Structures are given as structure tokens and as C-alpha cells.
Design a binder for this molecule. Structure first.
Ligand SMILES: [Cl-]
Ligand SMILES: [Cl-]
Ligand SMILES: [Cl-]
Ligand SMILES: [Mg+2]
Ligand SMILES: [Mg+2]
Ligand SMILES: [Mg+2]
Ligand SMILES: [Mg+2]
Ligand SMILES: [Mg+2]
Ligand SMILES: [Mg+2]
Ligand SMILES: [Mg+2]
Ligand SMILES: [Mg+2]
Ligand SMILES: [Mg+2]
Ligand SMILES: [Mg+2]
Ligand SMILES: [Mg+2]
Ligand SMILES: [Mg+2]
Ligand code: NA
Ligand code: NA
Ligand code: NA
Ligand code: NA
Ligand code: NA
Ligand code: NA
Ligand code: NA
Ligand code: NA
Ligand code: NA
Ligand code: NA
Ligand code: NA
Ligand code: NA
Ligand code: NA
Ligand code: NA
Ligand code: NA
Ligand code: NA
Ligand code: NA
Ligand code: NA
Ligand code: NA
Ligand SMILES: [Sr+2]
Ligand SMILES: [Sr+2]
Ligand SMILES: [Sr+2]
Ligand SMILES: [Sr+2]
Ligand SMILES: [Sr+2]
Ligand SMILES: [Sr+2]
Ligand SMILES: [Sr+2]
Ligand SMILES: [Sr+2]
Ligand SMILES: [Sr+2]
Ligand SMILES: [Sr+2]
Ligand SMILES: [Sr+2]
Ligand SMILES: [Sr+2]
Ligand SMILES: [Sr+2]
Ligand SMILES: [Sr+2]
Ligand SMILES: [Sr+2]
Ligand SMILES: [Sr+2]
Lengths: 115, 145, 119, 246
RNA sequence: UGUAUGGCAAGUCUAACCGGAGUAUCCGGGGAGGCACAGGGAAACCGACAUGGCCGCAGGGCUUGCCCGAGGGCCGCCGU
RNA sequence: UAUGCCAGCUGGUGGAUUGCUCGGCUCAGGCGCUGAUGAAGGACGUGCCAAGCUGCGAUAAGCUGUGGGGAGCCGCACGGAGGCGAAGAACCACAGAUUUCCGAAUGAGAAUCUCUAACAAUUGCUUCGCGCAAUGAGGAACCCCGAGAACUGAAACAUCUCAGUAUCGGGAGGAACAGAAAACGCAACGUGAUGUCGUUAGUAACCGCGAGUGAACGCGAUACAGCCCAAACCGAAGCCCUCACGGGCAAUGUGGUGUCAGGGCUACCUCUCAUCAGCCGACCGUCUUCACGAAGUCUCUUGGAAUAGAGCGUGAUACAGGGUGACAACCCCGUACUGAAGACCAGUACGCUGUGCGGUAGUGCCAGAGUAGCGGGGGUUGGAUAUCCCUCGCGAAUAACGCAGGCAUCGACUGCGAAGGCUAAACACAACCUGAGACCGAUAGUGAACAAGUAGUGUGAACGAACGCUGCAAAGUACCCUCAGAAGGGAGGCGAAAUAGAGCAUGAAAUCAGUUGGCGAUCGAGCGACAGGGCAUACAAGGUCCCUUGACGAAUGA
């Protein structure tokens, strides 16, 4: 049982978008967020740079950390970003909250899940 | 409700027969007792192995991989920008209480660096020289002979 | 102390001179104005009016002041025994108000009239 | 956002920008964790006498006299937990760490979050506070710090339609249970928090349920009593500014 | 040594203690030191994949079997 | 229906429960020695009437003084008699008087008494006389120096472990001990007295290399403070007692100098604000105690009583807590604010008097012996070759020398001067004072809320309970009847209540008396569960239930 009200709302929002719109991603992200904290994603930048491509939103079902270099013009969506992560991403691309990604793309199209 | 909280009424509190939870006999002796007899399993074998050198004749080197230097060069604007030049002794943490500073060769070197340190690995040189750079040994580093 | 046990203890186990404050009653409107005090230590010559018990509304002279029991006897505020004898009903000075004072003592009068001290 | 400043008569006197911390997302679980820690950290170590019930040379007679192997002295049972006058088996121990640790970042986030809960008028009304305002917190001028009389603060809060909260806290509850015997007979609702800058308001402190604080040290507890976010607060113009860098 | 929850994250946490104060709470200091950030070898001493290949779950894409395929799996390769 | 079974009703018994807290428990701050000037402890006394407790000491619940306090008082303890107090008592603070006997117990003896002038005993000084002094014993633990187990762990057990623990002997203080390097040894161009706290670290080290055991240097803090001899060179220039006189000490050396920024001597330069001795002497802070101190005791209703409900009003730098006939900021004590005193910090800091810091050159003048060191045997330690100590034997140098830097020797290097001494502050404990509590709430919490280390047990060492609650106010039951009767009973009186009537709030269960319902002297025993009948039932808090017929109608099914 999650104790954070904001995470409980995010999960409920990801579920609403999965059922209402044509997305399968948001329900898949909701299922991972309902799972224990240790199973959540702790991803550094060197992994987003390796596996992501432009005009395809990167969805992290956890938190993005700041180790490594990111050169690609990618839009990264996550539950949270570290201070350095968000700074390094905004220099070459855009760090967006998973809450905004649900409003901008309720259908969950052209999206890559990275962990 | 915890496991502990549901025990009133169980009598044995999960211990099986009430003849179980008594003294040290239930544990096979006190502490590490029987580490070679009845409970030898998963214990490190008996014996002496090796020697130790006196702590004041021991050297502690402060290490850093080329990858750590290379990923943070644009962020290290507080250090020399040549035709990049960086004194490694000023980058590594805990380099005060250390004997010497050594640059190791793990990762890639995407920039042209001129590194100044007390020691370098064969691979640390190869990666820096292989991407248009130089390696400078200190006056303290003049021990390699 | 803020602790109830210690508070009640200091009141019951208080020395005789400190028990004077346990026999204090509020002064009337006129007497408060005349002497600049809200209350006074009830004396065996004062006239008092009962404000709270079964004798509420009755006036009378203070006949006795017991410091040890921190209680007072007022004239006609009595109880009738089985034999017929009218014995005094002890009153707490907190349920009482002073209407007239006994100023036969020079020290008590001076204490009441001084702005720096109180009686 | 913008915060309306009020003078000592309760009329508007301009407006300054409401600082960024008041937009920190309300997080009741973190606020509650910080109040739980503060309440626990002031609790005193206690425990029964280590030797209570052990001061006896009582011995068991063993088998033979048709009696249970219970330690006896002068034909009276002693020491053992099942015996009257015996030791307490698992008693409260003085050695127990009754303190809760909290990370500075986690605690600081809770202070910021509780400060932010103070800016939402609906959360403040949900907490229980009685007031007739739209704008919350109540921002007053620095001349509030110069007030001496309590009755003068009553007039200002009546002019600010925020006095109804003190009427709510003007009712002492005589608690159920033995706390009475230990000094905890009464309790009352928590009302308005007064955050000043120089010194805590001597003028406002005695008001029913009121708590006075200063911007440099106002904590999670005075900002959210009992862990419940959204306390009806009143800041001094300089207090609002200083509470920004917290 | 696990686990659940929460903060922060290539970092993280302060300990004693100091100042403040609403004075055991609490606010601000304090990174000494600990653990993590490289390992292997008794020691001397030496010192690593920010990815080279193939499968492929979830998910995404398309002209609806075909592509991209984090994680995972099988290998290579690297340090000692 | 007898004896009797089950449930209940009325009344007991019992004292659970609920409510209450004069006691505990724990934490925190402050403070901290007493005694031959006879302590602490104990004994026996002491009151108008006095058994216990408390106090006190033949001046005996007290005497005197100053201050405070105040119209009352004569302790716990509300009686009777009587007395004291405006000649200012009680009561509180400080100071003083008195202060029996035993007790370190000291003239000698002795179960608290006795016998014929007493520092007994051991010491120092000495006028060699007990003339002047000292020691003894106590204290909650803390502290320091010695002696030193075992159960236990190792699943046995011997080394090891429990543990230098328990316990024992000796001793100091308000704190002890330690302490100005023959140090450290992140080896350095580095640190710089000592405790202690955090860490270093369960690291190094030990160990039937099993189980287990276990530092330090350094670092971050706390607090900070550095000095005096011996000797050289001087050589009576000196010290103690006494008012003085005078006496005593002292060449086997008092005193000057000096003490690793080595010193002394000789020759010079300059100078002191060091050091040492001594005078003066706090602020602040902290702890405790004290003075002062705002505003309702208005209306109505209920009540035995208003702090309750409804209504009206007030203070607040004071809405902590307590008391008061029920829940109180405004009735009383207090509480905020301001101020005062004492104690501790502390005879410290600061200030002051005196003294004089230091430098150059020369000078083998001085600088702590059973020592440093080696060996035999033991203990102890993490100390391993490399801990610390004891014991027996041996045993050096002289600063041009010596010790240390974790095996020995020699050389180098770096550090440092042992075998003389003192030393503030930061830390331990909790007797004593005060404060605090998510502690217990009378079979709990102390053994002890009560006569508590009491009653009581044991020759003794020692052991050791139980017992809290009338009521707003004693108004604590007059009178009458009965009776052997201050008994008890009846009637009666008080109070809101006597089923509040004295171990008297509430008043459970086991259980007892009387009684109600059901069963009952021809009948069978886990005492019941589920069905269904008899009989029994005031209200309230449940309101359903029966029969004809009709509707629907699963499986099954004439
Ligand atoms: Cl990663
Ligand atoms: Cl080694
Ligand atoms: Cl050092
Ligand atoms: Mg007056
Ligand atoms: Mg007990
Ligand atoms: Mg209860
Ligand atoms: Mg004698
Ligand atoms: Mg054994
Ligand atoms: Mg073995
Ligand atoms: Mg040991
Ligand atoms: Mg060392
Ligand atoms: Mg001298
Ligand atoms: Mg040993
Ligand atoms: Mg008891
Ligand atoms: Mg009763
Ligand atoms: Na058992
Ligand atoms: Na260092
Ligand atoms: Na005992
Ligand atoms: Na029995
Ligand atoms: Na503790
Ligand atoms: Na650090
Ligand atoms: Na019979
Ligand atoms: Na003391
Ligand atoms: Na007596
Ligand atoms: Na005396
Ligand atoms: Na003597
Ligand atoms: Na003599
Ligand atoms: Na065993
Ligand atoms: Na045996
Ligand atoms: Na051993
Ligand atoms: Na009253
Ligand atoms: Na020896
Ligand atoms: Na050394
Ligand atoms: Na009892
Ligand atoms: Sr189990
Ligand atoms: Sr046992
Ligand atoms: Sr074996
Ligand atoms: Sr460091
Ligand atoms: Sr009395
Ligand atoms: Sr009395
Ligand atoms: Sr037998
Ligand atoms: Sr931190
Ligand atoms: Sr120092
Ligand atoms: Sr010497
Ligand atoms: Sr050597
Ligand atoms: Sr009892
Ligand atoms: Sr016997
Ligand atoms: Sr009667
Ligand atoms: Sr049968
Ligand atoms: Sr049919």
C-alpha cells in the first residue's frame, strides 16, 4: 500500500487514460508503479542516450538519475527526475512529468519504455 | 496487524511443539558453537591464510577512471581550457589523505585531454593518446624506474 | 509546579503563616475602591455575606477563623444537632464576600492603605 | 501569486508577491511523519526499578509437599512473574530509544509542504478552522510586532473576519481517563498561528488556542498541529519574505 | 540479513558538538567519519563493456503478418 | 409433596469493578562532604492528662536575637481542663543558647552502666610538660590503591570464556585519578600536557588460530595552563614558636641562583611586562526562595450545592496547574510582566604590587642507579619477538652521553631527556534541593500511599507482611420503649442520599438465608448443540405469528 497521495493519484490517472483512450502503455506503467518501490526504475542518462530516438517519447516507469551524457533531442517522461537529471535533459531535450504526458498523449502513441 | 499481534491464543507462538523453544540446545549451542561439527555447513573452513604487512608501510592510492573525467569536462569550466587540460589531483575526492593519485582506463575518452597525475595505467595512456591527447607525470610521479 | 499532586500537597502541607492566603475572601465594590485590593484575609471582627452555599444571601459577623482547616464560622450560619444545639456550619472564604472590616489593629489598617503592600 | 497586506485597522495596504514555497504540493504523509517525529522526540525515558520484585532470597521447595515449584519466603510466594509482589517479566526499560530519526531533506520538505497547505482556503476550512475569508494566509503589516495589548489583537482579527476561530478554541475539554492524575486534565482546539519576524507575539499568545512563532524557526508542528495540514495562519510582511528561503 | 513504505541520488547520512530559540521538543550549523562510486592478488603489484553479436517478453510502430524492441536470455570481449 | 435440581427476586457474605491519589517509578537541572569544638547512629528521657509518630534534651513538641509574618495560636490529632497572644504570639529565614547516656569513643572497666584525674593508642613539634598539633569514625553511589572466585560459554573439557566481574582489604574528594614528552611516527618542511565525548573499528593484535577476545596513532569536539625542585655557582645572607624576652631548627646546608625557549661561570648587548610570590576582587549566568500582580461571583432554569444549560458582561505580556458543595482566565491560591534575596560560578576573571624576559661568544662546571639494560620464573594485556607489572640473579654511560621510532646487532636519519615534584577547567555519582512524565494507580507502582523496615519469624547472620475512600457540612443520631445492658433491637431524629451510620463511595463472581418460576420421591450419568412441544413472562429497548383460499412453482413426482 502506497503512502504518497500524489503517486496514488498518478496511478489512478494512468489507469483512467488506459481505459478511456486507446493506450496500453499507461496501464502497463500503472502496473509497475503498483509493484514494490525496489522494482521501480532507477535509470541514468547513459541508457536514454543509448536506446532512445528522436520524436519518440521516452517513458520511464520510475525515476531518472544524472549519470552519463545525453546528446539526443528526446522528450523524457518519468515519475520524478533528480536535480541534475532534469538540468542535463533540458539542455538538449525536454524533461516532462508523467502527469503531463497523459494529457499531451492520452492514446500513448510513439512511446518507448526504458528501465 | 502484524504477525506478533496475532499470537495471543496460539499457545506456541509459531514454535511448533511446546518442547522446542527452550534454551541453547534448540540453537545447537551458544553462538558459533559446532561450526566444525554438527553445523559445519556454509561456514568458512578452519585455518590460517596469508600474512599482513604493517599498516604504516601500506600505501593507499586515490583512483579515478577516464570516463569520470571525460563525462564531466564541459561542467569543469573552473579548470584549464587549452587547445582541455586538467590536473587530476584537483578532481579526485579524498586526495589529501591518499598517498598518490592514479588515473585508470575504464570507459571512453571522447575529448582531447591533457591529464596531470602521479600514476597512469597502460590503458589510461592508450585511450588518451589515441584520441589526440597527452599524459603528464608529476615530480612525485617520477618513481617509475 | 504544574503537577496536581504537588499543587494539592503544597496547600495541605503549608506552614501556618502561609495559611493566611487560604482564608482570603473578595471585598465588596465599595471596599475594593477604598483600599485598592480585590480581596482580604478574613478576620474575626469582619462582616461577611454568603454568596454560594445553602446560606447564600445571608449576612453576619465572623466569629472564628481556623487557619489549620482553612475555614470560617459566621454568625447565624448554623446547623441544628439532634439534641437541639445550634453548631456552626464551617464556610470556605472563597464562597464569601466582605462587607465591613475590623480595623482595631493599627498594622492591618496600615497594610490595607499602603499601595506597595496588601492585606 | 499575490498576497494582500492589511494594516492594524483591517483595511488593505497594498500587496506583495506570495513566495514560491506556498506552491509546494501539499503532502500530508510527510507532514504527518515530521509531526510524529517531533512528538516522539520530546518523550521521556521511563521504566520500572531493575530490582523490583528481586529483593528476596525466596527459594523453591521443589518436589515433595504437594506444591508448585514456586519460590517462597516465609510461606509466601515471591520473585517470579506469576507471583503477587513478583517482578514484571517484560517491563518498560529506560534503555529503550524512544526517539525517531528524520532526514533533513525529508523534514525540510515537510516544513515547505505545511507552509503551502496554509495557502489553500479549502484545506484550512477542512481542518476545522472557523473564518469568513477567501484569501489565506492572512498577511498583516510589520507594525503588528509593536502591538502590546491582547484586546487590540482581538479587534484586528474581528476586522479581518478571522476571530471566529478563537471562539472555536474557547472551549476546554476535560479529557477522559487517568491523564487527569498526571497533569493532563485539559485540552483545547488549536486556532490561529501568528508568525512574526523579530520576536514571537506577546500580544497574541494568550488568545484561546493561539500559537506564536517566528519565521526563522516556525516548524511543521505549529504549521500543522497533530499532522493535520492547513492551519489558519497570519504572517507579518517580513515573516512572509523570510519564510521563503526555508 | 530480508521486506514494505518514504527522501535524496553518483551519491547519501551526519556523530560528538556549536549557535539560536518558543530552551529535553524545535530552527540553523557541524561531513569527523561511514557506506556506495572497481576489482583481482597472501603480497609485491596490476587495474575493467558510458555496448560488438544473436534471440526475444512487455510496450511502441506499420500499409496488420513486418519492423523498433528497455528489462530479460545466450555469447563475445575487457581487469586480475 | 419431603431431601432436592436449574434460573431469578429480596437480603447478606465477599471486595472485584469504575471513579479518585497524600505513594511510588524514571528522566533532568542544581548542589555536595561530616567527625576528638566528640560526628553519623543508638539508648533513655521530655507534654496538664500522652501509648505510637514527629520534635526536642534535665533550659527537653522547646529558650534568646534580627528580619519576615500577623490575629490568631498551644505538632501528627477535630478531646477535656486550662493557657499564650497588640509587651505583636503562632508561623518562616538567618544567627545563637541549651544539648543526658552509649557511640571513632579516647582515664579504667561495662549488653547504654560503673570505678578512682585522664588527647587511650600511634605520631610530629617541643618550653621534653599532653605544652601545641595530627590520626581514628561516618557518607547514596561515584573515585583511587591492593586481594581476587565460581556457576556459565566453548553445546563435554584442561588453555580460553564468564572476568580483573562478584566478593574481600586499604584510602581520598566534592568530585577523584591523570597531566606539561627520554611523547607521537597519517615518516613529515608534520603534531605538540591530561582527561573525556564522537569516530578511527569489531580495524591492527590475541586465540585448543576453536568458541571467543580486542586496542592505538590520527581526526571532529569539550575544556584549555602551565610550572616547582635536585645539582652547578653562591654559603647563614634562612625558617619555626613567642606580644616580647627568649627558645627551637639549620654547614649531614636554611636561604639565593636554576630547571631544554638547558642552566651555571667569564666577557659583553639589550631589556623586562615572561614566570613566580602576593593584594584586590566581580559583571553575567544558573539553581532556589520571595514581593507585586488584571477581569463577574450578575439574570433565568435544574439542583442539597451552579464551576451546568440559556442570557448578558469582563481581563489577558496572565486561556500553566491547584482549591472551591458539579465542568471556573475573571470566587481563592496562583499564572504573565517587573523587581528582590541567598547559594553556586569564585577568592575565579579582570585590575594591581613586586620580580625580571631574552640574545652573543667562550667554557667536556652541573643535570635524579640497583636505575637503563640483560637473564631465570610468573602474572597481566589486543600487544603479537613488538603490553604493563611482580619476583630471584646480574648490570652501564655521563650530554663529546643516553632513550625512543612495534624482532636483535651496527651505521645513518627523525624525535626526545628517564631513574625528583606540583598543577585550574572540560568528564563520574546522586546523598541533598527543585523541576518533568504517551510511566503505575492500592494483588499495580518501592518491601513500604496506612504503625513500614512497622507487626511478626530466627540463637544469630538475616528474614518480613497486610491494612487508602462517611458526608456539602458531623448535621457522627436527642427523646421514648425493650433488655442483665454505653450491647443489640424497635420507634424516632439529621441529610439529596443512612442500602452514605463509622474498615461507612461504588459494591462483581464464588457463595449463604428467605422466596418466585419450572421439574420432582418408577427411575440413568460430559450436564449440551440443533428441531419441536408443556408451563412461566408489567412497561421499555424486538413485532411478528396462525388458519381458508388464491398466485408463483427448482430438483423430484403420483
Ligand atoms: Cl542506469
Ligand atoms: Cl597487507
Ligand atoms: Cl600527527
Ligand atoms: Mg493595600
Ligand atoms: Mg511488584
Ligand atoms: Mg477507563
Ligand atoms: Mg571508657
Ligand atoms: Mg559447558
Ligand atoms: Mg570445540
Ligand atoms: Mg578480555
Ligand atoms: Mg600509537
Ligand atoms: Mg628558587
Ligand atoms: Mg588472559
Ligand atoms: Mg503494594
Ligand atoms: Mg459502602
Ligand atoms: Na515453547
Ligand atoms: Na588529516
Ligand atoms: Na527485602
Ligand atoms: Na496445591
Ligand atoms: Na534511552
Ligand atoms: Na566526508
Ligand atoms: Na438429608
Ligand atoms: Na548538595
Ligand atoms: Na504520645
Ligand atoms: Na541541638
Ligand atoms: Na586528639
Ligand atoms: Na607531651
Ligand atoms: Na554445553
Ligand atoms: Na560434566
Ligand atoms: Na586460547
Ligand atoms: Na468558591
Ligand atoms: Na624479569
Ligand atoms: Na619516539
Ligand atoms: Na491495597
Ligand atoms: Sr516460526
Ligand atoms: Sr533458564
Ligand atoms: Sr569436522
Ligand atoms: Sr574525508
Ligand atoms: Sr496544624
Ligand atoms: Sr489538623
Ligand atoms: Sr523425590
Ligand atoms: Sr545532510
Ligand atoms: Sr593546550
Ligand atoms: Sr635529568
Ligand atoms: Sr629495525
Ligand atoms: Sr487487598
Ligand atoms: Sr534455625
Ligand atoms: Sr430508623
Ligand atoms: Sr447404559
Ligand atoms: Sr411445474
Amino acid at each position: 500500500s502506497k503512502t504518497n497521495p500524489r503517486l496514488s493519484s498518478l496511478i489512478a490517472d494512468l489507469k483512467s487514460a488506459a481505459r478511456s483512450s486507446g493506450g496500453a502503455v499507461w496501464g502497463d506503467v500503472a502496473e509497475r508503479l503498483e509493484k514494490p518501490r525496489r522494482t521501480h526504475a532507477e535509470v541514468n542518462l547513459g541508457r536514454i542516450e543509448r536506446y532512445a530516438q528522436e520524436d519518440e517519447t521516452v517513458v520511464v516507469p520510475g525515476k531518472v538519475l544524472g549519470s552519463g551524457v545525453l546528446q539526443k533531442d528526446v522528450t523524457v517522461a518519468a515519475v520524478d527526475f533528480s536535480g541534475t537529471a532534469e538540468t542535463k535533459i533540458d539542455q538538449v531535450g525536454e524533461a516532462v512529468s508523467l502527469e503531463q504526458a497523459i494529457e499531451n498523449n492520452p492514446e500513448g502513441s510513439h512511446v518507448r519504455v526504458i528501465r | 496487524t502484524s504477525k506478533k499481534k496475532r499470537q495471543r491464543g496460539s499457545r506456541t507462538h509459531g514454535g511448533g511443539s511446546h518442547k522446542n523453544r527452550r534454551g541453547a540446545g534448540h540453537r545447537g549451542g551458544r553462538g558459533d558453537a559446532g561450526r566444525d561439527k554438527h553445523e559445519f555447513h556454509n561456514h568458512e573452513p578452519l585455518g590460517k591464510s596469508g600474512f599482513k604487512r604493517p599498516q604504516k608501510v601500506q600505501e593507499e592510492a586515490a583512483t579515478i577512471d577516464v570516463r569520470e573525467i571525460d563525462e564531466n569536462v564541459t561542467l569543469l569550466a573552473a579548470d584549464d581550457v587549452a587547445e582541455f587540460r586538467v590536473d587530476v589531483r584537483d578532481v579526485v575526492e579524498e586526495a589529501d589523505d591518499a598517498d598518490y593519485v592514479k588515473v585508470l582506463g575504464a570507459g571512453q575518452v571522447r575529448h582531447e585531454l591533457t591529464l596531470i597525475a602521479d600514476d597512469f595505467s597502460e590503458g589510461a595512456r592508450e585511450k588518451v593518446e589515441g584520441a589526440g591527447g597527452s599524459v603528464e607525470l608529476t615530480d612525485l610521479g617520477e618513481e617509475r624506474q | 509546579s504544574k503537577q496536581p499532586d504537588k499543587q494539592r500537597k503544597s496547600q495541605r502541607r503549608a506552614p501556618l503563616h502561609e495559611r493566611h492566603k487560604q482564608v482570603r475572601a473578595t471585598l465588596s465594590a465599595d471596599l475594593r475602591e477604598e483600599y485598592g485590593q480585590r480581596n482580604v484575609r478574613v478576620n474575626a471582627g469582619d462582616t461577611v455575606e454568603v454568596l454560594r452555599g445553602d446560606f447564600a444571601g445571608e449576612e453576619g459577623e465572623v466569629i472564628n477563623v481556623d487557619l489549620d482547616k482553612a475555614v470560617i464560622h459566621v454568625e447565624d450560619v448554623t446547623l441544628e444537632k439532634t439534641d437541639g444545639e445550634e453548631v456552626p456550619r464551617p464556610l470556605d472564604t472563597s464562597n464569601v464576600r466582605v462587607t465591613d472590616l475590623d480595623l482595631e489593629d493599627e498594622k492591618r489598617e496600615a497594610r490595607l492603605e499602603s499601595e506597595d503592600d496588601s492585606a | 501569486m499575490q498576497a494582500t497586506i492589511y494594516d492594524l485597522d483591517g483595511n488593505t495596504d497594498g500587496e506583495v508577491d506570495l513566495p514560491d514555497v506556498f506552491e509546494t504540493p501539499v503532502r500530508s504523509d510527510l507532514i504527518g511523519k515530521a509531526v510524529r517525529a517531533a512528538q516522539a522526540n520530546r518523550k521521556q525515558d521511563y521504566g520500572s526499578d531493575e530490582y523490583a520484585g528481586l529483593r528476596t532470597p525466596a527459594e523453591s521447595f521443589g518436589s515433595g509437599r504437594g506444591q508448585a515449584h514456586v519460590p517462597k519466603q516465609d510461606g509466601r510466594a515471591r520473585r517470579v512473574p506469576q507471583a503477587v509482589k513478583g517482578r514484571s517479566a517484560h517491563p518498560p526499560k529506560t534503555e529503550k530509544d524512544r526517539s525517531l530519526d528524520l532526514n533533513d531533506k525529508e523534514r525540510q520538505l515537510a516544513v515547505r509542504s505545511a507552509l503551502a497547505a496554509t495557502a489553500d482556503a479549502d484545506l484550512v476550512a477542512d481542518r476545522g478552522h472557523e473564518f469568513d475569508r477567501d484569501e489565506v494566509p492572512v498577511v498583516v503589516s510589520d507594525d503588528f510586532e509593536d502591538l502590546v495589548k491582547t484586546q487590540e489583537v482581538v479587534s484586528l482579527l474581528e476586522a479581518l473576519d478571522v476571530h471566529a476561530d478563537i471562539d472555536r478554541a474557547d472551549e476546554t475539554k476535560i479529557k477522559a481517563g487517568q491523564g487527569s492524575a498526571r497533569g493532563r486534565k485539559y485540552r483545547r482546539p488549536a486556532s490561529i498561528l501568528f508568525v512574526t519576524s523579530d520576536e514571537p507575539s506577546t500580544a497574541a499568545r494568550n488568545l484561546a488556542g493561539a500559537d506564536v512563532a517566528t519565521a526563522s524557526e516556525v516548524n511543521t508542528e505549529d504549521l500543522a498541529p497533530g499532522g493535520a495540514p492547513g492551519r489558519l495562519t497570519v504572517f507579518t510582511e517580513s515573516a512572509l519574505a523570510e519564510v521563503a528561503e526555508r
